Amino acid sequence: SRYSSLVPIEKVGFTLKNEINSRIITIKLKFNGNDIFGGLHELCDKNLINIDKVPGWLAGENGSFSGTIMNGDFQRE
Amino acid sequence: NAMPYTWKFLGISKQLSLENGIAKLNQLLNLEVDLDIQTIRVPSDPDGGTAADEYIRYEMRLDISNLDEGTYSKFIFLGNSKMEVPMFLCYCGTDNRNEVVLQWLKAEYGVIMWPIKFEQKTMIKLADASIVHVTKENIEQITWFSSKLYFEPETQDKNLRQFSIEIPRESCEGLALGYGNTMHPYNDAIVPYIYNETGMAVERLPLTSVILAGHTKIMRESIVTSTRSLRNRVLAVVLQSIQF
């Protein structure tokens, strides 16, 4: 082991909405696994993801809950 | 399925002049192969150095059943003599004569061929190429498709087995407007936006497919389409992708 989590999540989704020049741009991210944030941890270590650019919400800051992030404000559901 | 045509690609060591002739293969196959030859231009607006951008497009249809589309069998060649690797072919369908067409090309022409594989960056370029529509006046136009990128990373104990990033049609357009006008929206606007917003570098991750809804699915070693053919520009990008 090395990447396990206290409470492993197997499915989680995020919708990112940003307002750019008064237009709403939406992207949707979905993850599947035995322990998603552990997998994401490993990818960041292997440098496949840039940790400095990983927003709090993708790093798990509230992990466990799928949600929408609207101009930087997370809201689960 | 909704995309029943699965294309595989092969580099070829010389520009085949099939013009003449299919006849030898026709009798071998005891079957009438139809051979179409046209010159195309990519970029299309014929104002692009009236050459170099001219390719030659060949098509061989294996005439047969029309019940199950999964057996529809077509060969497409794109050639450009002003390039170092001047031709590739691709073919769809599961017909047994496919492999018999390949060994014939070899013999008849004494060419070697190799499986073409697409790196992430090329999968991106192919996505940009797939969404170009060509009007009757040979104008190229970007059209918008809901787009989905799939990844399948290798992690301990299957911790993360799969993840995807989806950009609805309207947000693909929306992202291009912040750029703004571009014939390469995935490369220029959408893929960078993902990196800057997530730290995810698409071209470095285990990207296993890019799906343009109802149109095409671009993968590492094939392209799947709902259309019984591939677009000129997608072909041109494949050929550019195998140069040195």
Swiss-Prot record, chain A:
Coiled coil: none annotated. This is Inner kinetochore subunit CHL4. Component of the kinetochore, a multiprotein complex that assembles on centromeric DNA and attaches chromosomes to spindle microtubules, mediating chromosome segregation and sister chromatid segregation during meiosis and mitosis. Component of the inner kinetochore constitutive centromere-associated network (CCAN), which serves as a structural platform for outer kinetochore assembly. It is found in: Nucleus; Chromosome, Centromere, Kinetochore. Belongs to the CENP-N/CHL4 family. Forms a heterodimer with IML3. CHL4-IML3 is part of a larger constitutive centromere-associated network (CCAN) (also known as central kinetochore CTF19 complex in yeast), which is composed of at least AME1, CHL4, CNN1, CTF3, CTF19, IML3, MCM16, MCM21, MCM22, MHF1, MHF2, MIF2, NKP1, NKP2, OKP1 and WIP1. Interacts with CTF3 and CTF19. The lineage of its organism: Eukaryota, Fungi, Dikarya, Ascomycota, Saccharomycotina. Present with 606 molecules/cell in log phase SD medium. It comes from the Eukaryota. It comes from Saccharomyces cerevisiae (strain ATCC 204508 / S288c). The chain holds residues 374 to 450 of 458 of the full protein.
From Swiss-Prot, chain B:
CDD domains: IML3. GO terms for biological process: ascospore formation; attachment of spindle microtubules to kinetochore; cell division; establishment of meiotic sister chromatid cohesion; establishment of mitotic sister chromatid cohesion; maintenance of meiotic sister chromatid cohesion; meiotic sister chromatid segregation; protein localization to chromosome, centromeric region. The keyword Plastid does not apply. Transmembrane segments: none annotated. Its main location: nucleus. It is found in: Nucleus; Chromosome, Centromere, Kinetochore. The keyword Nucleus applies. GO terms for cellular component: kinetochore; nucleus; outer kinetochore. Component of the kinetochore, a multiprotein complex that assembles on centromeric DNA and attaches chromosomes to spindle microtubules, mediating chromosome segregation and sister chromatid segregation during meiosis and mitosis. Component of the inner kinetochore constitutive centromere-associated network (CCAN), which serves as a structural platform for outer kinetochore assembly. Belongs to the CENP-L/IML3 family. Forms a heterodimer with IML3. CHL4-IML3 is part of a larger constitutive centromere-associated network (CCAN) (also known as central kinetochore CTF19 complex in yeast), which is composed of at least AME1, CHL4, CNN1, CTF3, CTF19, IML3, MCM16, MCM21, MCM22, MHF1, MHF2, MIF2, NKP1, NKP2, OKP1 and WIP1. Interacts with CHL4 and CTF19. Present with 125 molecules/cell in log phase SD medium. This is Inner kinetochore subunit IML3. The lineage of its organism: Eukaryota, Fungi, Dikarya, Ascomycota, Saccharomycotina.
